[PDB]
Amino acid sequence: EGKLVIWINGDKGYNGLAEVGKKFEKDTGIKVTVEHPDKLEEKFPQVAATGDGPDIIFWAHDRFGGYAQSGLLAEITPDKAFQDKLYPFTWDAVRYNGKLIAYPIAVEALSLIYNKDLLPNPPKTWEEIPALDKELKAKGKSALMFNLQEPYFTWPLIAADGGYAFKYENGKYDIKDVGVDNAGAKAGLTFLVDLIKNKHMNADTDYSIAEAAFNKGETAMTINGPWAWSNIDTSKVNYGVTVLPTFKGQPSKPFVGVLSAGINAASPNKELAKEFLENYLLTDEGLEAVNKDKPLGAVALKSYEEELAKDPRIAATMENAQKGEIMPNIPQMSAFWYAVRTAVINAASGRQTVDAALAAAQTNAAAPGLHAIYGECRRLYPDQPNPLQVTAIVKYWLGGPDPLDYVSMYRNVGSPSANIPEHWHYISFGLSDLYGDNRVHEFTGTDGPSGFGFELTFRLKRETGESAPPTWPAELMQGLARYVFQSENTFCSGDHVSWHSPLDNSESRIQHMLLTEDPQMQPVQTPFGVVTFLQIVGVCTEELHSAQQWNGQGILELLRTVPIAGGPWLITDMRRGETIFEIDPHLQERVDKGIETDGSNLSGVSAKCAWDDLIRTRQLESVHLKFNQESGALIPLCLRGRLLHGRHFTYKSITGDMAITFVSTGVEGAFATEEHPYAAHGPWLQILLTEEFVEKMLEDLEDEFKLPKEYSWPEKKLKVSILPDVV
Ligand SMILES: OC[C@H]1O[C@H](O[C@H]2[C@H](O)[C@@H](O)[C@@H](O)O[C@@H]2CO)[C@H](O)[C@@H](O)[C@@H]1O
């Protein structure tokens, strides 16, 4: 046996297609499920990896070339007698690198739908509409309303003056030659932004807002595909479907899309899928059942096409399809669509000028490394297609100071069941290789790290009454990114960073940072390398010191067990006023134990100290070490945490040039022999302590405020005193 699961976008006929699925189950006994998940075009390549996905997937052909290259689609194998049933150009739309990768279903193209009662003669040009809108606003109506959230609906205007996505030149598509940035495209988008300034259209208008407006008669026009006609029938609005308005004398060029059905390559039911598609859905009866639910446009099945051809609504669809351009199916299409999805929104909402919104989409459409990261982000935040975002306006590769080209700011609602608070999630762009053209980072192929190999992320606890994420952390990430770039020393999970300043420039006690693998962002494959995601975690100086004395990983584990200091997701709360050792005093024990068993990472310190006798190599037999109180409290960590693990530890002087290097029995390099344990080169003193003597010395050192204290022995002496160093 086997099941058959189908995905089809919500605006299409999923109920008519379900009827066809019923007839299949009747005649065959195989159950056909139909689902219309949100953002199915993005979710497919996500869950086709785990094969948790549909046996069949429906969408415009432009997406498929991208699926096919990722090996997510099985090649379809119709015989000649079936191929003759559909038009040759619709098989063209589903052909990628020589193979048929999906069955074509229907041809879609945007048309101008107008309310005959409100507007008997629809305007032949775009420029007519501002005028036409004043007349309609007088009697309380509007002239035009259509989806401005999706570039698919505003692209006909942008392309009217000849703006394009990729150029069909010399037999192929030129992937770097994108045309969203030329005069024609700016002329089209400038005109769209104008309409919104003069309040003929509103930037907030999405699909369901426009559809409701037109179907209640509140607006005289709209732009939409054959699928929308069904609901205008139910509204009983007296409407007609016609050619789109011209712009500057040239026609609107809508991207024509062929609704196609592909078969999952991980489907165990490729044969059942071939039967359902070839001998049920693709016939006069099957296509009819889907057309009745929501019109398909001009179907690819020659027979049922000639039957509907009379329908003037179809005639107007193909008239606009002729003036438009058929969408390419190359993998780079999704990139292009996203680049423009943003450009149009930013340019319309006022976030950005038309001239720079399109100049942005130009570099970002071409740019593979950027795309991949956005793809993960969109995997985490499906319902935030346009996040507040900081952009470096003077790019880092034109001499600019700030190396992060972008920093995106998402809203993470957290988890109420697992005690993870609502917070802001920042992701950076530019530490990895975004463009792969040797502009910022050396191109090192698909094998190895992409640029530095990671991007920063940050999770900031949401303060109360905060409508939007603050922007100060984007500044911080610019600071860290500069730190990495200039030094060329990369970071790993567990590393620490001394910042010595409250991260937000308020008095916050959080003044440092540990780094750790972001708990949600998953490493990505890029055509320029691999990109993992490091997350910054704010910490107090007390905690930064623990991480230096013990380890980064160990302290990170602790921040996870104290919810108000990070929790499982290590969220930074900038209003935290207590260290984790003051919240849970019994944690200090865990660290000390962690040091006794793992050992200290601290190889030395710059502190107030000196030594005295009681270039050459002076061999001595009586030594008097002098420390500050602060650096004297270190001595037990030096003994227990390093000399016992067979490691050296060095105190540098900083008031001079003296130094004291404690050396265990049996470490290479070092000139105290233990025939004569106290040798000096210099101001450079090395003193070797046997395990026996270290263990007893630790008993004798118990750190109260008495000074100067002094400890003595048969070997040696050790003072801790106060001002002498600074004087
Ligand atoms: O807007 C970007 C989007 O455009 C196209 O999506 C269309 C789709 O082709 C239509 O059948 C209908 O469902 O409207 C969609 C836009 O809301 C592209 O096919 C798609 O890849 C792209 O992301």
Author numbering: 5 to 618, 701 to 789, 795 to 818
Authors' account:
SUFU is an essential intracellular negative regulator of mammalian Hedgehog signalling and acts by binding and modulating the activity of GLI transcription factors. Hedgehog signalling plays a fundamental role in the control of metazoan development, cell proliferation and differentiation, as highlighted by the fact that its deregulation is associated with the development of many human tumours. It is demonstrated that GLI binding is associated with major conformational changes in SUFU, including an intrinsically disordered loop that is also crucial for pathway activation.
The N-terminal domain exhibits the same structure as previously determined, despite the presence of the N-terminal MBP fusion partner. Although the crystallized protein was intact, both SUFU molecules in the orthorhombic asymmetric unit show no apparent density for the C-terminal domain residues 279–360, suggesting that this region of the molecule is highly mobile. Collectively, these data suggest that residues 279–360 constitute an intrinsically disordered region (IDR) that is an inherent feature of native human SUFU. We show that in the unbound form SUFU adopts an open conformation in which the IDR hovers over the surface of SUFU that interacts with the N-terminal domain of GLI proteins.
